[PDB]
Design a protein around this ligand. Structure first.
Ligand SMILES: [Mg+2]
Ligand SMILES: [Mg+2]
Ligand SMILES: [Mg+2]
Ligand SMILES: [Mg+2]
Ligand SMILES: [Mg+2]
Ligand SMILES: [Mg+2]
Ligand SMILES: [Mg+2]
Ligand SMILES: [Mg+2]
Ligand SMILES: [Mg+2]
Ligand SMILES: [Mg+2]
Ligand SMILES: [Mg+2]
Ligand SMILES: [Mg+2]
Ligand SMILES: [Mg+2]
Ligand SMILES: [Mg+2]
Ligand SMILES: [Mg+2]
Ligand SMILES: [Mg+2]
Ligand SMILES: [Mg+2]
Ligand SMILES: [Mg+2]
Ligand SMILES: [Mg+2]
Ligand SMILES: [Mg+2]
Ligand SMILES: [Mg+2]
Ligand SMILES: [Mg+2]
Ligand SMILES: [Mg+2]
Ligand SMILES: [Mg+2]
Ligand SMILES: [Mg+2]
Ligand SMILES: [Mg+2]
Ligand SMILES: [Mg+2]
Ligand SMILES: [Mg+2]
Ligand SMILES: [Mg+2]
Ligand SMILES: [Mg+2]
Ligand SMILES: [Mg+2]
Ligand SMILES: [Mg+2]
Ligand SMILES: [Mg+2]
Ligand SMILES: [Mg+2]
Ligand SMILES: [Mg+2]
Ligand SMILES: [Mg+2]
Ligand SMILES: [Mg+2]
Ligand SMILES: [Mg+2]
Ligand SMILES: [Mg+2]
Ligand SMILES: [Mg+2]
Ligand SMILES: [Mg+2]
Ligand SMILES: [Mg+2]
Ligand SMILES: [Zn+2]
Lengths: 60, 98, 127, 24, 116, 155, 78
RNA sequence: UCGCUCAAACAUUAAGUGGUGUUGUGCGACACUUA
RNA sequence: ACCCCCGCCGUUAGUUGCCAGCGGUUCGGCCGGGCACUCUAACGGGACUGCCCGCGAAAGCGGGAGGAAGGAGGGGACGACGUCUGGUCAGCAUGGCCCUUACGGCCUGGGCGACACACGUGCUACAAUGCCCACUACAAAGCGAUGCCACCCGGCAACGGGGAGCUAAUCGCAAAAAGGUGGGCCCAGUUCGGAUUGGGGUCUGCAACCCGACCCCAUGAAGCCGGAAUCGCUAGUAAUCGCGGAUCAGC
């Protein structure tokens, strides 16, 4: 159940305690940052590409 | 009297647009306090590299959100038209209030 | 007239406003022997004054902020040095060899990832 | 005791306040 | 003095002496002192005869304590026992009532480690 | 390290008497990085020194650490596949290190309640010629002369 | 804990009200082990599910403040 | 408090075998190997 | 090596800060005023074996001065041709095989939380360099519109209610803790230790039996720094003490 779940994640038919976070890009079930709305994986992928504005390689 | 906020990401583009306003306001009106850099609010995001299990070698980024402040005193009519027309922003979301 | 110098260590800054007089030392209000209580490093910060042979002859006034309690003391130590050396070129020829003019690069380093404390790694195992 | 459910640092470690710990 | 019927916390802090009393601890110890104006520092070895019956009878008749308290504790368990709630069956086999890590430790109720 | 000898850490001289040996003692006392706490704890015993005997804490400290300074010790070493307990002189630094160290431990061995009184009484028996730390010194020197046979491998 | 208005299902009270409305049997296969037992519901038999089947667990005075799940095993050998 | 035999559990091994090492039962005062 | 942080200082800007210099003092940088100085970030210089002594053919090493800092100054980013037929078809994409009124779809309840046992990684202790408690002081970084909560009242309290400010260097989370002065404690399974269990409450959520966190009263367990074995770490490191976020209804 991968496809039927990504659709159900956007449904929110019953109570709000089912509208769990869900990555947008690859539709991951966990590790979904709320700010980006993406999973940790696709997040890094884009960041290397430069498609993430203001997101620079951290070094300190 | 008037106060302008110049939020944005790239400080190179923030410096060009902030310096532009300082020349346009002073060279055509009353006094204007130069660019006042504020504490850059940064979003440091840490995370793991590999897709599966690798609680190490992880990689992390940071969202540089800059801040620059510029105050113009006397409401010059030349400065209002100058900034309304001669402007070249881009990724710099500015917000101005009295 | 006055002797000024900048103090700093572990992000604990300390302005040093010194004025020749008695020995009354105020730092961010309060007295020196008052603010620092039960700390031997206190009398150590006044080391620059004992090196110049003028302990009780100067009213100090320092603005030390940020950092820890002791980091301030080290900020005062270097601050007083820059203060008395400001109006004294010859007192640098005997304050420097005694080691005083240094920001003390010694500072806490970043806690590395994968580790626990920038160096200490979790207990290795194989069982 | 950083584990006492009724002490000064007892709540300081648990990130709470309560009675024994001063609260507004 | 024989305070709680049989218990005799002599020769020590008056407040701590009450802690030894079953059903009485650190909190109920200070409470008896602020309701009878007793100094926690003074010992039981040197107190007034009036303060004896005073503090003693007070806490004694006030709240539940001693074996009769313990009887109620087991009484409730007889109730969790007569039917068999999930809480009771943990007392049956000796398991914890929190459903904690039984796959690992929890030796406090399970007794010593029966390697076997 | 295999390359350099790695130079000693030149510590800060005493901030009350003017002597590196005293500060070094504070460090051994220093639990969880509380120098100012241990410093006082040390000066506390210094005053207990003048209380008992009209003697300066300075020389009472020197005499103590001196009489607990191990002259020789046995070190293990391999030879073809066997361990010999070879005795030989210690380095000046190591003697000072062990001396200061044992003393601290000998204080912990004492039944004395307060730490300062433990270091106080211990500093007396040490400067004297008989104490918990001193007896641990006499003990190590015995091992040296005992195995004096294997002293042929001075290396 | 639900101190403001004791939690429980409507169909529970509804099905059990008609049981008191004329004093019927007690058979009632439920699926809400999350609910609190009703006081006057003594003498009935709620067939509480538990993943496996319906447990004919009776009821009485003492068993009231607790849940329906309290008196229904969810694991084998317990 | 020590000496000893035996049967588990754990530790050394990359792993096994064996052994070695501690605690448990009853009494007397490293080496070898790995289709 | 060029990239960033902390290292010396200045250049640019002044709602961060200054009884410092003066007037009111409610004796609080609260008002006036100012930016030199602290700070907030941005640009640039600086250290290069450059100087002297000694060894040396060269490269280079050792010692001394000036300097904030010497021989990469400390840390990070950065981890080659490849190996481990390493890992991942449950992040995703994907060749082929297999299911297709069910290996697909929906809900409710249960289950990853089971316990006679074993191992790894951790928190907190087995206490008088200390435990319980009253007062006082010094951080960095971060986050905050369906969220952070200053002030007033109820109670033992969690918590609730009234209600001001905030697109956030100037409003909130916030007392940093340890530490400084003072008190009881007196070597005791202890004012150490809070695990376990009884009863009564609060918070979020359709729903805290299974299976949440958090108060309060009580019960006050194992537990005297630990065998064979074994781990971390070379300096602002170890050890030790508090703080923040992500994740997130709450945990
Ligand atoms: Mg996609
Ligand atoms: Mg020096
Ligand atoms: Mg550190
Ligand atoms: Mg730092
Ligand atoms: Mg850092
Ligand atoms: Mg501790
Ligand atoms: Mg918090
Ligand atoms: Mg209140
Ligand atoms: Mg009942
Ligand atoms: Mg044996
Ligand atoms: Mg047997
Ligand atoms: Mg036999
Ligand atoms: Mg014998
Ligand atoms: Mg053999
Ligand atoms: Mg064979
Ligand atoms: Mg300027
Ligand atoms: Mg300036
Ligand atoms: Mg050259
Ligand atoms: Mg040249
Ligand atoms: Mg020459
Ligand atoms: Mg050359
Ligand atoms: Mg040359
Ligand atoms: Mg030098
Ligand atoms: Mg020079
Ligand atoms: Mg070099
Ligand atoms: Mg590289
Ligand atoms: Mg496939
Ligand atoms: Mg396809
Ligand atoms: Mg079929
Ligand atoms: Mg503060
Ligand atoms: Mg920062
Ligand atoms: Mg948060
Ligand atoms: Mg509030
Ligand atoms: Mg605002
Ligand atoms: Mg605050
Ligand atoms: Mg103290
Ligand atoms: Mg106790
Ligand atoms: Mg307790
Ligand atoms: Mg519950
Ligand atoms: Mg030890
Ligand atoms: Mg043994
Ligand atoms: Mg939240
Ligand atoms: Zn994703």
């Amino acid at each position: 159940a991968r496809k039927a779940l990504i659709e159900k994640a956007k449904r929110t038919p019953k109570f709000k305690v089912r509208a769990y976070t869900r990555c947008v890009r690859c539709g991951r079930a966990r590790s979904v940052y709320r700010f980006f709305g993406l999973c940790r994986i696709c997040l890094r992928e884009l960041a290397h590409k430069g498609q993430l504005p203001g997101v620079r390689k951290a070094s300190w | 009297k008037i106060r302008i906020k110049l939020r944005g990401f790239d400080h190179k583009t923030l410096d060009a647009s902030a310096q532009k306003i300082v020349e346009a306001a002073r060279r055509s009106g009353a006094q204007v306090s130069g660019p006042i850099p504020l504490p850059t609010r940064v979003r440091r995001f840490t995370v793991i590299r590999g897709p599966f299990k690798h609680k190490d070698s992880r990689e992390h980024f940071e969202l540089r959100t800059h801040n620059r402040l510029v105050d113009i005193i006397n409401p010059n009519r030349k400065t209002i038209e100058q900034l309304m027309t001669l402007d070249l922003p881009t990724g710099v979301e500015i917000e101005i209030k009295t | 007239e006055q002797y000024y110098g900048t103090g700093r260590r572990k992000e604990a800054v300390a302005r040093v406003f010194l004025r020749p007089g008695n020995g009354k030392v105020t730092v961010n209000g309060q007295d020196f022997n008052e603010y620092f209580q039960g700390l031997v490093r206190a009398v150590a910060a006044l080391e620059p004054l004992r090196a110049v042979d003028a302990l009780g002859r100067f009213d100090a006034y320092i603005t030390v902020r940020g950092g820890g309690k002791s980091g301030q003391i080290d900020a005062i130590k270097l601050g007083i040095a820059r203060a008395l050396v400001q109006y004294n070129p010859d007192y640098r020829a005997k304050l420097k060899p005694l080691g005083f003019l240094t920001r003390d690069a010694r500072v806490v380093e970043r806690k590395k990832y994968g580790k626990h404390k920038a160096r200490r790694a979790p207990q290795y195992s194989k069982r | 005791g950083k584990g006492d459910r009724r002490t000064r640092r007892g709540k300081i470690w648990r990130g709470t306040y309560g009675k024994y710990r001063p609260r507004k | 003095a024989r305070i709680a019927g049989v218990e005799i916390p002599r020769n020590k802090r008056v407040d701590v002496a009450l802690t030894y009393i079953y059903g009485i601890g650190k909190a109920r110890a200070k409470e008896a002192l602020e309701k009878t104006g007793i100094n926690p520092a003074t010992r039981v070895k040197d107190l007034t005869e009036a303060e004896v019956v005073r503090l003693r009878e007070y806490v004694e008749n006030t709240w539940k304590l001693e074996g009769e308290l313990r009887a109620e504790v087991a009484a409730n368990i007889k109730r969790l026992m007569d039917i068999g709630c999930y809480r009771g069956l943990r007392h049956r086999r000796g398991l914890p009532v929190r459903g904690q890590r039984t796959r690992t430790n929890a030796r406090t109720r399970k007794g010593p480690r029966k390697t076997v | 390290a295999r390359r350099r000898r790695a130079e000693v850490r030149q510590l800060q001289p005493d901030l009350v008497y003017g002597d590196v040996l005293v500060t070094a003692f504070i460090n051994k006392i220093m639990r969880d990085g509380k120098k100012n706490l241990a410093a006082r704890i040390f000066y506390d015993a210094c005053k207990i020194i003048q209380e008992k005997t009209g003697q300066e804490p300075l020389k009472v400290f020197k005499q103590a650490v001196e009489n607990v300074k191990p002259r020789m010790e046995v070190r293990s070493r391999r030879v073809g596949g066997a361990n010999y307990q070879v005795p030989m002189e210690v380095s000046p630094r190591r003697q000072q290190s062990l001396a200061l160290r044992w003393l601290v431990q000998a204080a912990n061995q004492r039944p004395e309640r307060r730490a300062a009184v433990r270091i106080a009484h211990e500093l007396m028996d040490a400067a004297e010629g008989k104490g918990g730390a001193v007896k641990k010194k006499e003990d190590v020197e015995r091992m040296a002369e005992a195995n004096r046979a294997y002293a042929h491998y001075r290396w | 804990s639900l101190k403001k208005g004791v939690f429980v299902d409507d169909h529970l009270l509804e099905k059990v009200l008609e049981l008191n409305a004329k004093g019927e049997k007690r058979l009632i296969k439920t699926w809400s082990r999350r609910s609190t037992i009703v006081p006057e519901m003594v003498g009935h038999t709620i067939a509480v599910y538990n993943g496996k089947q319906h447990v004919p667990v009776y009821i009485t005075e003492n068993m009231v403040g607790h849940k329906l799940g309290e008196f229904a095993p969810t694991r084998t050998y317990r």
